[PDB]
A paper describes a structure:
Here we resolve the functional dynamics of the 0.7 MDa III2IV2 obligate supercomplex from Mycobacterium smegmatis, a close relative of M. tuberculosis, the causative agent of tuberculosis. M. smegmatis lacks genes for a soluble cytochrome c and employs instead the QcrC subunit to shuttle electrons between Complexes III and IV, thus making the SC assembly necessary for its proper function. The SC also features a C-type superoxide dismutase (SodC) and subunit LpqE, both of which are anchored to the membrane by lipid modifications.
Residue numbers in the entry:
A (entry chain V): 15 to 157
B (entry chain T): 1 to 139
C (entry chain Q): 27 to 170, 182 to 336
D (entry chain U): 2 to 56, 69 to 79
E (entry chain N): 502 to 536
F (entry chain S): 20 to 203
G (entry chain M): 320 to 370
H (entry chain N): 391 to 445
Amino acid sequence: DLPYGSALTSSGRISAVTEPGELSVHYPFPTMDLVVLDDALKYGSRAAKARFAVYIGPLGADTAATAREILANVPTPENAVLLAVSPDQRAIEVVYGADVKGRGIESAAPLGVSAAAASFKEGNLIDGLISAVRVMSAGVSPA
Amino acid sequence: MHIEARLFEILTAFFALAAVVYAVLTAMFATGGVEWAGTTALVLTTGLTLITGTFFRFVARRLDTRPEDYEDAEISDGAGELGFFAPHSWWPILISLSFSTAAVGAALWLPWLIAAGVAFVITSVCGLVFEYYWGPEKH
Amino acid sequence: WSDALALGWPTGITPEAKLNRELWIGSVIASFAVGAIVWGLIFWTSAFHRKKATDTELPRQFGYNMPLELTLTVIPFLIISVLFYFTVVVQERMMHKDPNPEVVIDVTAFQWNWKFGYQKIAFADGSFDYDGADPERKEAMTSRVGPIRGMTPEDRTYLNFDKIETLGTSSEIPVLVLPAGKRIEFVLNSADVIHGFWVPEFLFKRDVLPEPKANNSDNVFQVSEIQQTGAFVGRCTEMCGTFHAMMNFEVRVVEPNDFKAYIDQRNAGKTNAEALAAINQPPLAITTEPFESRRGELV
Amino acid sequence: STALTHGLIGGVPLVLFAVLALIFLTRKGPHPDTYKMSDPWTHAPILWAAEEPREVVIGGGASGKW
Amino acid sequence: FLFPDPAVEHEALTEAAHASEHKSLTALKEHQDRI
Amino acid sequence: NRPNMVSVGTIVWLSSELMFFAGLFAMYFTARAQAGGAWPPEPTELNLALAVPVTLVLIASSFTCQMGVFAAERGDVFGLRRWYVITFLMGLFFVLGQGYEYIHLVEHGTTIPGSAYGSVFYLATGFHGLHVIGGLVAFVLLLARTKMSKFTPAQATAAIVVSYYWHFVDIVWIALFATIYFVR
Amino acid sequence: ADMHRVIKRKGQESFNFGELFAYTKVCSHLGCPSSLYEQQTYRILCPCHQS
Amino acid sequence: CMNDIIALKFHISLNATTWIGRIGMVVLPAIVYFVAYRWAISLQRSDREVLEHGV
Amino acid sequence: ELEARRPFPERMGPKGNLIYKLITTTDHKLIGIMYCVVCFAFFLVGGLMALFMRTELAMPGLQFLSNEQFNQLFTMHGTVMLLFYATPIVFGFANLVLPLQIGAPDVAFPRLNALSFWLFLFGALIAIAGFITPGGAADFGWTAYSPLTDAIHSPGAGGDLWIMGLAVGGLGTILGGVNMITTVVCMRAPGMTMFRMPIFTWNILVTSILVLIAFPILTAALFGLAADRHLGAHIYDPANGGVLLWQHLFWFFGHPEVYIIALPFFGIVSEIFPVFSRKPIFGYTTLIYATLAIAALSVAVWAHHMYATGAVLLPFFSFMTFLIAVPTGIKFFNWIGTMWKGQLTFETPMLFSVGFLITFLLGGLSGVLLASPPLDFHVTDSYFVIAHFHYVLFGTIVFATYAGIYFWFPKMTGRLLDERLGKLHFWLTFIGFHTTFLVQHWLGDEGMPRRYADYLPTDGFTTLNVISTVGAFILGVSMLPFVWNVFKSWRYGEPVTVDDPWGYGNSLEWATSCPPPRHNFTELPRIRSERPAFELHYPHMVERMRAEAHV
Ligand code: HEA
Ligand code: HEA
Ligand SMILES: CCCCCCCCCCCCCCCC(=O)OC[C@H](C)OC(=O)CCCCCCCC[C@@H](C)CCCCCCCC
Ligand SMILES: CCCCCCCCCCCCCC(=O)O[C@H](COC(=O)CCCCCCCCCCC)COP(=O)(O)O
Ligand SMILES: CCCCCCCCCCCCC
Ligand SMILES: CCCCCCCCCCCCC
Ligand SMILES: CCCCCCCCCCCCC
Ligand SMILES: CCCCCCCCCCCCC
Ligand SMILES: CCCCCCCCCCCCC
Ligand code: FES
Ligand SMILES: [Ca+2]
Ligand SMILES: [Cu+2]
Ligand SMILES: [Cu+2]
Ligand SMILES: [Cu+2]
Ligand SMILES: [Mg+2]
């Protein structure tokens, strides 16, 4: 079931390969936009002492139960604030753990949804994610 | 480690043959006779490979097969402590700065700078050699 | 065409030079053939063994072809054995010395000009004899216990002094005058560091050493004859300091009777330039001119 | 000449650089094209998280659409 | 530097040194814990 | 069950350091071939009444060094210290004896600037003497380290490789002494 | 041979006696004897602060 | 202040030593400030490493 | 199966991440990177020297340089390119990958390794500091012939600084050789037998043996030269036999030297060809034998540099020099056989290795021409020799060095260099090199000697000199895309999250992450051949590899 050229090693790690001249990562966004989003995540999380996360993919039919399922994959999920987006279903969800409750996220999470939605209507996915992370982390205190 | 010894013994055979051939061929029909610089260099290149090969050959016949000498050894044969490998040190750059001080002193022929550089070298080399052997301070 | 294959080698003006040029052309052709084969093999696999779009499995994983490995060590050995044989033949012919040269020249290199002395002339037909050695001046150099076999390093006795000498100057290129058709012997000594005696039309050069005998250098070489008259540049070919690029000389090859007239003029007290004008030659060097003594265009 | 010598030495390198950089740097690199919202999301699902702070009762959430 | 002392002397000295070092560390530690 | 890594590194380096003396031997033999029959030339009068005892002291320092190695391999730090102190004293005696020979040679007109023989004699024997001084520094540093912690196998390995260096220096001296004082 | 390179100061054009010139040995910076006279460069160097 | 002694002993032009001092008087303190700042923070990180992982 | 990742990997470490590491590190990976950076800075400095020389040689007459400055320029250009760029970058590459290739966590002596690097850096700085003296740097050539180098003929402090800087750096090189040999004989992983090691490791080991022969005798010769220059010694006195004493000693160093900076780079292309051919290396055992034969022979051919001195036994050295051509041709046949019937893709490492093959071939043919004393009697000390050794050097330490950099940059950094910019870099380098150096064969054959600051308009040399200078300035601009690529790719390059970005790597470094952890390996595979990473990543092929191995 392992991809071609991938091997399970004696430590349990996977030793994988790429064809020469091909890429390992291949996210459909420009490198400098990815760097901007990475900085938004890092410095928003540092300023709020809560781990901010972003999901892109299919959110199902309820799309909030699925988002709560995805939040379990963020490290220390009790202290995390996930923004999940379905470009197809055109759905925006924010879900956070219990550690963040009462720290300013009830005011800021809908503001993050609005910030994302405004940029999505222009067809700017990564710009919407960056703006939403910026507003939600600026509204959470390290409490 | 028989291959390690064999490599140096093969080099030794070639170097000894080259030294003998060169000395004999320059003694006969070469102006001035034996060419002493090249003959000396070839003889002592032979000596270099001979010293290392004899040491390896003596070591090989002592210890039985290591896991890196064994054609179908398992990775787990090599389990255990390897040895001590220094995690960090700023003494190497101090030793090189000291030796460079003495070298600049010798280049410009400043005997006081040469003396200072040699003293720096001895202090830096002591610092390196003692780094993992100084005990706790005593009070 | 022999000029394109010679790659800028001069045609040569001595028999030894012509033999060396033939060896050069043959060796160039051999190396070009080997290079064409190897380059073609590189271009072939680069052109026809590139990964296609319709190959899913890896190529055949061969890594050993023993008969081919053995066959590809014998052929280059054969080519270098042939080249070594002809190399030995030509160097034996080029380094050959006859016991009776017809002109013996003393070449003295110094930093950074040349001095040419006429040591001896013995024409093969008896039409010209001249004894030019001046041993009453080699003895004036004796410096004498001494650091080296009783001698100080200022001994200089190994240098040769002659009655007729052409001395180079920063404003006059030294012109060495030689007869055509005659066996010429060159004895090379340096006054200080190592220089290089290169006449490109000789297709040959040798290093000019201080104290060559103590260094086991053979400082003597001959050309069997120079096959045409004319003027030929010579350059220093061993890095000797500041003015290594600016100590050139010229060889003027004239007919033997004109050489005799030139030597009579020099024996009559004439300088090199006026003795050359006396035999209807240009008085100064014509392949090269003196370098401006200004250190450059910014001065 | 002397102006031709300086024209060649200065000019040939820059012309050659411009030509080779037009040949090679105008090609498309291996980086994927940027996803367009009007197109379907055919990539694998992506989960990004910040590594800070250095190291499951839900506390709430919000929803939205666009 | 050149000759060993009797082993009993070495043992007693080493034990005393270790006990003294431990007592000094403990004194500093308990003062720190108190304050 | 495995090679002593420090030992192999030391042996490899010592074999390289043989080439350094190869250069100096080449200088000596080149100057000797150009001697012209007088080697050593006047006024150099080598005396074996003093070179021989100094050579013998340096040779006996090898046996004392080997005794120290046997003590170290036995785990006996005090026997190692005693034998290495003796070896240090004997090598220091060699250095002083060489210096006295140098002083008496200089007064009679054999110097580095003075003659080609003086140049080769002094570079050869003086670089060997510098190697001896480096080995004495090595003894001092090793002996100080044995006072710093308990005597472990790594400490004994350090003693062994210092002895490898000392034996190299002694053998190089035997070669230099044979070629200078007997193959004149 | 160097007299054609001499530039005179205004008011001092006749202060030299032919090829003899006389300047104060006191440095105008801070008063040290500025007396390191380089004859080929014609440079007067002050040992104190390198004027 | 010792530029003339340094010029004599270490084969530097005296004029060059003056200009090295003049430019270095601005440049060397800036370089040293930057290096010392980064070096101090680097020692702080070296301490942190031992605190999380031991010796 | 959602694993949280970052949108982009961290561009740089925080403040204070690097500076204390640089001065305290015993990590061979960091030391190798430090070697590569510093050696490349020295390469740029030496290239600037060559650009000055080439600009002055474009026209007859001295336009901006004097004779003295030009002589310093070729002396120091040769010194910097040979001893401050190529020789230490051998140990830069060895530090980068050799412990990985044998499956070790470290080199045998980590602090000695750090000392070797710092000795390189400070010795090189001591030699280059001659340029800040009034007289200037050494101006007697990189070969430093006697008696031109004696206190009478080269009095300046530049020459003495050159001597002592070379001595300090040479000690660094010797200690590096000791370390590399000891690492290979002691730190191999279980099952990594001597005849399963990669060819690069074999070549590093044999090169280290060569280092232990050549550099100590050069150190002895330099100390004799310093004794003459400072103490009035007579070592290199002409009446004492000193001219050829110097030449014999120097070339006994100087020939081994040129193969110290050839065999490691042969090993680099031996690593690269099988990956991009999707094939094994052809004749693995024969390649090892060829390396050993070349190393043995390179110690017995030195006087082919002395043909025109009239004082060496010509047939001995001529025959030995011809013999060296046989194992090198074996290497050329082994490399073409590795490519033969593969699936070639020509990414930047492969492209630079092919540039190696093409350029080195002409260099070696020219060298064989030089090996016969009669032809060397005309072409020695001329620009034919210059063309030869730039064809043969630039092939190993530029094309194979760049091949190693493009190959192993993802392994050492976790980022890929941009391949479009790499192709621009290759084609500028390849076109520029042949433009500057092919016409120098003709110039030397006509009669233009090496090491001339000036010539006359009537010499017939001007047009080819102009062409060579045009090519040299192409080589100058070829450096800009590479430096830009590394600067951009080091922080913003394509992330590498696999172990083998080139797909078909064979050596153990491709069986670990990009970059490796501090001690290089979180696990090791079973080692049963010289392609352990290939067998790890393609188990289904192992049977085929055993079946198809013999034609
Ligand atoms: C070993 C490697 C090596 C390398 C890579 C080179 C590289 C080059 N070399 Fe060579 N060279 C030698 C080794 C090497 N060299 C040796 C041993 C000698 C003999 C020395 C002696 O005579 O004693 C020699 C001598 C030599 C001569 C003969 C000089 C003479 O006899 O008079 C010439 C002639 O043109 C030449 C040219 C070049 C050129 C144009 C490059 C091109 O690679 C260089 C162009 C490259 C650049 C890199 C330009 C710099 C680019 C920049 C962008 C710099 C800008 C910024 C800064 C500098 C901070 N060099
Ligand atoms: C990387 C560096 C390097 C390498 C690999 C070489 C390799 C060789 N070199 Fe050279 N050389 C230098 C660097 C190098 N050299 C330098 C720097 C100088 C000048 C020093 C100075 O004076 O400044 C110099 C000078 C030099 C001289 C002295 C010339 C002179 O000054 O007068 C000679 C002469 O014998 C020589 C010859 C050779 C030969 C025969 C090889 C051989 O090893 C090459 C063998 C390769 C081939 C032959 C090609 C492959 C073979 C085949 C495909 C099979 C074909 C079969 C046949 C032809 C039979 N070179
Ligand atoms: C920055 C120092 C170097 C700057 C000066 C050179 C900066 C380098 C770039 C311009 C110099 C060469 C381009 C112009 C060429 C020319 O036409 O000649 C100009 C001058 C008329 O001739 C010279 O000879 C210049 C000096 C030579 C350089 C000595 C090398 C010094 C050693 C340093 C490498 C030590 C580390 C650096 C030390 C870094 C700082 C120390 C804390
Ligand atoms: C040079 C003195 C000569 C003495 C004659 C006998 C030689 C052996 C002496 C043994 C010394 C023991 C020191 C010791 O254990 O104390 C150690 C402390 O000394 C040192 O760490 C530095 C020693 C001096 C370094 C040498 C520098 C120059 C070398 C001179 C080269 C000739 C033990 O300290 P500790 O007990 O751990 O507190
Ligand atoms: C005809 C005499 C020649 C004898 C050969 C000399 C061999 C060189 C010996 C080297 C010395 C090392 C100490
Ligand atoms: C005046 C005629 C010149 C002919 C030049 C010959 C071309 C040489 C071939 C170049 C080598 C290709 C690799
Ligand atoms: C010219 C006569 C030959 C002299 C022989 C010199 C050989 C010296 C070797 C010494 C080696 C001693 C161990
Ligand atoms: C093995 C040597 C190859 C040399 C080829 C040189 C070709 C140079 C072409 C220039 C033509 C100028 C007239
Ligand atoms: C990639 C091409 C590099 C080779 C350039 C060859 C230049 C030869 C021109 C000869 C000019 C005739 C005088
Ligand atoms: S007193 Fe003259 S410069 Fe200061
Ligand atoms: Ca010019
Ligand atoms: Cu000359
Ligand atoms: Cu010259
Ligand atoms: Cu060579
Ligand atoms: Mg020559």
